[PDB]
Design a protein around this ligand. Structure first.
Ligand SMILES: *[C@@H]1O[C@H](CO)[C@@H](O[C@@H]2O[C@H](CO)[C@@H](O[C@@H]3O[C@H](CO)[C@@H](O)[C@H](O)[C@@H]3O)[C@H](O)[C@H]2NC(C)=O)[C@H](O)[C@H]1NC(C)=O
Lengths: 180, 48
């Protein structure tokens, strides 16, 4: 969409992810499998929920309605009465229809950042310890087990810890060693 | 209240026996449906 994640570089959603709206899949010597980022799926829901509750709270002071009755020779003030209600119900319909259509467009392009910005957090933590592969996905220079995945997932990876593991690899897939 | 109302006529006069005390005053409408009662209870009513 706007932010270019959903229906963007991350081509299509995973059906295998059921626990939540956004998450990580991994692969390593032991593991392989999905795991939703509940804490930020959770933050997203707090939003979309507030949004519904905001609209209900705007629609209790609409234009109200109770009834009135007219003589046969007052026909044209009957009309005026009718143009009125039918003016006001033309106007709250538009406001409803348009509010939904707009807040729908924003809600969809909200999810499209939720996902971009999740991708950017993983990125900023892992720097040149991992190779950004470009289809939504990173592969590591240092091997990184299930206990290290959580650390990425819960956002407390530790760059300096795997630095020389990683840069031994970078150093050699640069074939700079190939000179001896 | 405390107002008198004095009639006087020498013909063609249909007089009251009964009048009507406004006891409870509030909210309602003269709703214009053709359905008869269905023994339910709501908080929202519409002619359909
Ligand atoms: C229908 O009946 C009512 C109730 O009895 C009558 O109202 C009362 O009329 C008397 C006088 O006849 C009022 O007294 C007046 O009080 C003022 C000020 O306190 C005083 O200066 C006057 O000299 C006089 O006596 C009394 O207040 C009034 N009752 C109330 C509470 O409204 C009434 O006369 C009858 N309806 C009519 C006027 O056609």
């Amino acid at each position: 969409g706007l932010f270019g994640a959903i229906a963007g570089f991350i081509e299509g959603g995973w059906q295998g992810m059921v626990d939540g709206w956004y998450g990580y899949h991994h692969s390593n010597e032991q593991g392989s499998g999905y795991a939703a980022d509940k804490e930020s799926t959770q933050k997203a829901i707090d939003g979309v929920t507030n949004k519904v509750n905001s609209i209900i709270d705007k629609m209790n002071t609409q234009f109200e309605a109770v009834g009135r009755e007219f003589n046969n020779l007052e026909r044209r003030i009957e009309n005026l009465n009718k143009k009125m209600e039918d003016g006001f119900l033309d106007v709250w319909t538009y406001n409803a229809e348009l509010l939904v259509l707009m807040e729908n467009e924003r809600t969809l392009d909200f999810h499209d950042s939720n996902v971009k910005n999740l991708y950017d957090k993983v990125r900023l933590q892992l720097r040149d310890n991992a190779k950004e592969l470009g289809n939504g996905c990173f592969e590591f220079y240092h091997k990184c087990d299930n206990e290290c995945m959580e650390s990425v997932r819960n956002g407390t990876y530790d760059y300096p810890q795997y630095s020389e593991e990683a840069r031994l690899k970078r150093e050699e897939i640069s074939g700079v060693r190939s000179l001896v | 209240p405390n107002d008198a109302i004095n009639f006087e006529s020498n013909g063609n006069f249909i007089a009251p026996e009964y009048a009507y005390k406004i006891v409870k005053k509030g909210d309602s409408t003269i709703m214009k449906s053709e359905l008869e009662y269905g023994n339910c209870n709501t908080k929202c009513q519409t002619p359909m």
